[PDB]
Amino acid sequence: EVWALEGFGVAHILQEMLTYKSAPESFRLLVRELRSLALELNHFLVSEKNFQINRKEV
Amino acid sequence: SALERSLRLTFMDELMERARNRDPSGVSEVIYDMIAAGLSPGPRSFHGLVVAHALNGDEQGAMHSLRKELGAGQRPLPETMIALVRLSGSKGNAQRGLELLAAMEKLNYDIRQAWLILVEELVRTNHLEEANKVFLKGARGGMRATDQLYDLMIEEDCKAGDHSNALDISYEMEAAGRFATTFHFNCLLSVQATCGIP
Amino acid sequence: ASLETQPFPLFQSPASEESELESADPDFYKIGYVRRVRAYGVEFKEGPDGFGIYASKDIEPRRRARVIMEIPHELMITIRQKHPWMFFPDIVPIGHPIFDIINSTDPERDWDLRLACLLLFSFDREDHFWRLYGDFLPAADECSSLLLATEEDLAELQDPQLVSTIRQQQKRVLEFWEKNWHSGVPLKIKRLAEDAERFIWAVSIAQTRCISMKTRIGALVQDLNMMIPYADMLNHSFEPNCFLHWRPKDRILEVMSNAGQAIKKGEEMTINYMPGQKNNMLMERYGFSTPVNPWDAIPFSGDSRIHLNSFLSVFNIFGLPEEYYHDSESFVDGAVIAAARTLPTWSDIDLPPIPSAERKAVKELQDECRKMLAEYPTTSEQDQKLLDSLSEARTTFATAVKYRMHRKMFIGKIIKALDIYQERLL
Amino acid sequence: KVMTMDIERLLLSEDNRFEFVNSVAAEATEYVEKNRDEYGGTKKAIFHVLSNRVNDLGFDRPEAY
Numbered sequence: 066e067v068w069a070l071e072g073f074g075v076a077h078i079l080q081e082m083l084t085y086k087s088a089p090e091s092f093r094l095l096v097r098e099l100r101s102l103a104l105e106l107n108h109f110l111v112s113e114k115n116f117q118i119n120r121k122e123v
Numbered sequence: 124s125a126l127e128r129s130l131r132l133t134f135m136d137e138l139m140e141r142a143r144n145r146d147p148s149g150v151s152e153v154i155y156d157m158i159a160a161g162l163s164p165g166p167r168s169f170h171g172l173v174v175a176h177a178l179n180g181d182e183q184g185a186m187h188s189l190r191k192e193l194g195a196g197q198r199p200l201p202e203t204m205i206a207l208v209r210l211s212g213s214k215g216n217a218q219r220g221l222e223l224l225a226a227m228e229k230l231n232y233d234i235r236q237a238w239l240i241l242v243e244e245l246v247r248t249n250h251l252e253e254a255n256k257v258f259l260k261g262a263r264g265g266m267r268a269t270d271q272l273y274d275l276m277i278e279e280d281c282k283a284g285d286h287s288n289a290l291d292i293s294y295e296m297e298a299a300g301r302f303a304t305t306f307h308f309n310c311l312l313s314v315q316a317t318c319g320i321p
Numbered sequence: 322a323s324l325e326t327q328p329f330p331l332f333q334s335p336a337s338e339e340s341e342l343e344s345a346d347p348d349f350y351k352i353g354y355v356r357r358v359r360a361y362g363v364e365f366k367e368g369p370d371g372f373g374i375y376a377s378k379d380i381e382p383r384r385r386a387r388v389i390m391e392i393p394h395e396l397m398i399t400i401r402q403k404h405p406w407m408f409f410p411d412i413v414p415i416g417h418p419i420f421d422i423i424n425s426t427d428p429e430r431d432w433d434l435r436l437a438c439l440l441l442f443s444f445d446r447e448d449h450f451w452r453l454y455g456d457f458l459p460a461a462d463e464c465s466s467l468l469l470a471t472e473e474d475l476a477e478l479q480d481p482q483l484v485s486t487i488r489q490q491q492k493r494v495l496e497f498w499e500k501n502w503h504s505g506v507p508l509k510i511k512r513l514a515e516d517a518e519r520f521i522w523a524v525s526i527a528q529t530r531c532i533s534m535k536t537r538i539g540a541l542v543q544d545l546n547m548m549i550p551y552a553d554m555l556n557h558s559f560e561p562n563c564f565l566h567w568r569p570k571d572r573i574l575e576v577m578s579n580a581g582q583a584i585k586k587g588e589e590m591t592i593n594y595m596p597g598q599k600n601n602m603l604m605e606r607y608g609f610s611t612p613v614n615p616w617d618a619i620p621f622s623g624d625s626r627i628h629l630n631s632f633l634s635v636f637n638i639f640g641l642p643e644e645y646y647h648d649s650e651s652f653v654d655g656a657v658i659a660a661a662r663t664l665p666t667w668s669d670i671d672l673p674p675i676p677s678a679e680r681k682a683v684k685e686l687q688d689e690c691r692k693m694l695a696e697y698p699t700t701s702e703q704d705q706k707l708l709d710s711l712s713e714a715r716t717t718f719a720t721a722v723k724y725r726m727h728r729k730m731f732i733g734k735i736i737k738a739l740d741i742y743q744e745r746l747l
Numbered sequence: 748k749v750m751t752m753d754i755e756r757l758l759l760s761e762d763n764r765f766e767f768v769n770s771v772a773a774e775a776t777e778y779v780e781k782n783r784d785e786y787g788g789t790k791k792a793i794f795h796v797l798s799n800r801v802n803d804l805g806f807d808r809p810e811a812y
């Protein structure tokens with residue numbers, strides 16, 4: 066169904082179905098378990114305006 | 124008829140002569156003389172007074188002459204507003220620029236040329252940060268700058284490294300239908316290359 | 322009604338000889354409506370000056386531009402603007418002699434000859450829409466384009482450079498016809514234009530009705546010169562209420578009423594054929610002139626000059642020189658905007674105009690304009706008389722008279738503008 | 748019933764279906780920001796955007812048809 070929804074490009078429904086209908090807390094779980102394996106899954110986003118490397122809340 | 128016309132003629136000629144000589148005290152003399160002649164309304168006369176102040180940079184005197192002509196007169200002719208906005212942008216005073224440009228809304232005059240002048244003079248006066256403020260707030264207001272002004276402002280921003288505004292102006296330029304050329308992307312890349320994040 | 326032949330525009334309206342906008346023959350719209358043309362809120366009306374589009378209802382303002390017409394691509398004719406000639410209705414069979422003739426045109430000088438070849442072939446191609454539409458094109462005696470004029474008219478044109486350019490155009494067209502309709506051509510070419518008059522007519526129509534646009538045909542972004550059978554009925558204006566636009570998904574030419582503009586029942590729907598061309602260019606190509614032409618020019622050589630910014634403000638003209646417009650804030654019109662673009666003028670950062678020396682300059686330029694008027698043998702209103710009553714409505718001659726009259730009327734408006742500018746400078 | 752033809756008309760009007768739908772979402776969220784009437788009963792902001800846009804196309808449809 067994810068493959069079908071993203072085939073339609075209807076990606077805001079896909080976002081709804083995969084996040085707030087139940088970073089997302091399950092990605093928090095993913096990063097926390099890898100961080101528990103002693104791997105830093107580190108999420109950054111780069112300001113287009115300022116090139117500042119904003120670390121995401123993870 | 125011809126009496127009033129010749130009085131108007133000679134009085135406004137000696138006023139304009141004082142104004143070109145940047146003598147606003149003289150212009151005030153001729154205002155008083157025309158009031159004594161009963162020629163009380165006259166937009167050209169207060170335009171002469173404002174340009175007499177502006178040519179010597181008397182921002183306060185220019186605003187005083189504006190307050191005179193609005194408070195005890197009639198709507199100013201466009202060159203009055205344009206000249207006082209130019210005196211702002213050439214002096215700095217960008218807040219006064221925006222305040223008067225917003226006050227131009229109430230005359231129904233074309234704001235485009237005055238805003239272009241304000242931006243251009245601010246850039247020429249190296250008042251780039253507030254020039255960016257007035258430009259972006261105009262573009263978000265849906266006004267289109269002249270192409271020369273986009274090109275100059277982008278180039279000067281990128282020389283200043285102000286990509287935070289250069290990219291935004293480039294988006295507004297695209298939204299205005301001026302497609303970004305290799306020059307504009309070269310200007311953006313000149314600053315982007317500095318970030319160390321290729 | 323997907324058949325029939327010979328529908329025509331009732332000639333009751335072109336009967337002005339004894340001395341105004343009746344509806345066009347309903348079949349004129351029907352032949353389009355049966356072929357997915359749609360007119361929204363507009364009506365074809367038939368004056369002695371031919372067809373026009375007029376709003377049949379008050380149209381409220383809208384936030385986006387509002388559609389007023391849809392013409393489907395299948396009814397159009399197109400030539401590629403650039404060398405590799407292709408036809409997107411693709412009327413012309415592969416290897417038809419028409420392709421050899423059309424190739425023998427200059428890539429950029431003879432686009433009108435190419436369009437004329439297509440127009441004639443589309444009158445020969447049965448059950449092409451223009452087989453029916455050609456009856457509504459102006460015949461050789463009622464077309465305004467000066468390619469149908471002769472020296473009897475051009476003597477009345479009194480504009481030797483434009484006379485020379487019209488003569489060169491006619492020479493070029495007739496030389497092309499003589500070269501490519503010689504007796505050796507197939508019947509399927511000789512029947513297109515068996516005489517010079519048919520070809521010069523076709524070229525005059527191609528010139529007066531050629532729209533050109535950048536368009537997208539599927540994937541291909543391309544430059545086309547094209548004929549659109551209901552957008553070519555729009556009349557010119559330099560203050561147009563409409564513009565043409567292209568939809569590539571369904572290949573529709575929209576005619577769009579401008580965003581934020583209200584329009585009134587009986588208002589003429591007009592477009593800006595070519596923006597920024599002097600009246601002599603509109604005579605050269607289209608075959609008409611307009612007195613409010615805001616790009617017209619005057620051969621001034623005076624060292625007298627007027628304060629441009631004060632000339633603007635006294636007439637409340639606004640915008641940059643490419644942009645000059647007038648607002649509600651009443652004789653000010655396109656001719657005064659042309660004046661601001663044309664008068665010998667000076668400007669300075671803030672310096673005021675000399676109230677005396679500007680009157681001196683006004684007097685000098687007014688006497689220059691007066692001697693320019695004096696270079697014609699007659700005043701404007703003599704041509705107005707020669708148009709409110711006229712011997713035979715000879716369309717090319719009446720067009721030349723309209724040209725001369727417009728120019729004089731213009732210079733008159735220049736005089737009046739300088740007078741009112743001086744008076745209103747107080 | 749008919750409203751999807753208007754949708755198709757607007758889909759035919761706009762040069763990118765995804766950009767059109769983005770513009771509709773933008774128009775609806777700015778509508779529900781510039782006006783704070785609840786406007787959530789039998790008529791919906793999406794249908795309102797489609798109605799206003801087809802009215803710009805000149806077509807006689809009422810708000811939310």
Ligand SMILES: C[S@@+](CC[C@H](N)C(=O)[O-])C[C@H]1O[C@@H](n2cnc3c(N)ncnc32)[C@H](O)[C@@H]1O
Nearest residue numbers: 370371372459465529530553554556557607609
């Ligand atoms: C695009 S063609 C339209 C054909 C025209 N409606 C007819 O009856 O054949 C433009 C023609 O309309 C006329 N025309 C164009 N602009 C005009 C104007 N501003 N005022 C009056 N007539 C105009 C001229 O005769 C010109 O040849």
